[PDB]
């Protein structure tokens, strides 16, 4: 199936003293494999998945050097942006950046990304054609004009379509035992009497990967959204994910309700029903 590689960067200014707090993380699909925290002792890009530990010294040296360069750019940006928005030097602000590439089911470049945010809102983003920019306001417009003149889009395009895809393919092969394996959700249902006449049926989906999944409730073969509750997909902590959906029903009529589970790891959707 399709796969992706993404890098997330966050820098928070600390006006009271010192430089911004900078944190960077790298992911392949829903698996984190590297990180950098300016607050940590190593001051180096660090591994977070076993399959990336195969890389030699030159890899870690280059990645460390580059992530530090990323850090400084963000430090400068915080200053530049404080001026663009005419803000005080006494408050703390945030800049975020995210970029990456996707390969399709054919394993060929599918698409690339490069977006930026200031204080949690879109600032500037590269469009899908990887040739134009989307600026959210006049501060971003100034940046856009400068990046057009410096041809930053062309440079990012060469990375996203080349280096990015090539490395994503390399990581996929090296960590194939996990990255190219889908973990079908382990499902079951629980029954909870909320009163003498009503009961809650909760449909569980556990230990699945990737995170993408859909849980739906039907009553007498027809989708039901009322009297239901769906929680946000959450990380188990061991690399897999969890989710559940519940419905309140009249005691004694549990048999009319079915929970439908769709996930890439299942040849066909599963259907659960209570006793």
């Amino acid at each position: 199936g399709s796969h992706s590689m993404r890098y997330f960067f966050t820098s928070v200014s600390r006006p009271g003293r010192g430089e911004p707090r900078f944190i960077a993380v790298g992911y392949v699909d829903d698996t984190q494999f590297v990180r950098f925290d300016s607050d940590a002792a190593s001051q180096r890009m660090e591994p977070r998945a076993p399959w990336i530990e195969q890389e030699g010294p030159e890899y870690w040296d280059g990645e460390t050097r580059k992530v530090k360069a990323h850090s400084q750019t963000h430090r400068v940006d915080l200053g530049t942006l404080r001026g663009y928005y005419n803000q005080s030097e006494a408050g703390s602000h945030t800049v975020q950046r995210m970029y990456g590439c996707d390969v399709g089911s054919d394993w060929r470049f599918l698409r690339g990304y490069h977006q930026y945010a200031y204080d949690g809102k879109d600032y500037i983003a590269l469009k899908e054609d990887l040739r134009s920019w989307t600026a959210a306001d006049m501060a971003a417009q100034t940046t856009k004009h400068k990046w057009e003149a410096a041809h930053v889009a062309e440079q990012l395009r060469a990375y996203l379509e080349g280096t990015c895809v090539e490395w994503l393919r390399r990581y996929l092969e090296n960590g194939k035992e996990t990255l190219q394996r889908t973990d079908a959700p382990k499902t079951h249902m629980t029954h909870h009497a909320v009163s003498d006449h009503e009961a809650t049926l909760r449909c569980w989906a556990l230990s699945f990967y990737p995170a993408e999944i859909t849980l739906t409730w039907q009553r007498d073969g027809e989708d039901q959204t009322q009297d239901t509750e769906l929680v946000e997909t959450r990380p188990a902590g061991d690399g897999t994910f969890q989710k559940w959906a519940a419905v309140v029903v009249p005691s004694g009529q549990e048999q009319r309700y079915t929970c439908h589970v769709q996930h890439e790891g299942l040849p066909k959707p599963l259907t659960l029903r209570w006793e």
Binding site: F8, T10, R35, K121, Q242
Partner: protein, 99 residues
Amino acid sequence: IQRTPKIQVYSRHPAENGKSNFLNCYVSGFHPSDIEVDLLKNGERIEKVEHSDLSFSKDWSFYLLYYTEFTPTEKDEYACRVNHVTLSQPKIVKWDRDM
């Protein structure tokens, strides 16, 4: 812009008295990223708590997983305490085995 945190408290594996497990507090959809998250055992903060590396969703809001290794019992109560700028006072979500 500022955004308030969503909170979920749960165990990595189905709860079973006497058997080792992991207690999780997942905080998401928040901004800015500075936040205070504590796992509690009978009202007292657990010192041995770690968290994932700060990351964020498509809308730029942040998410973090705080977790600790614990062994559930029938009487001990667990909860997650979260403080953030968008909160007038620390919020506390108690752990429920069925959720």
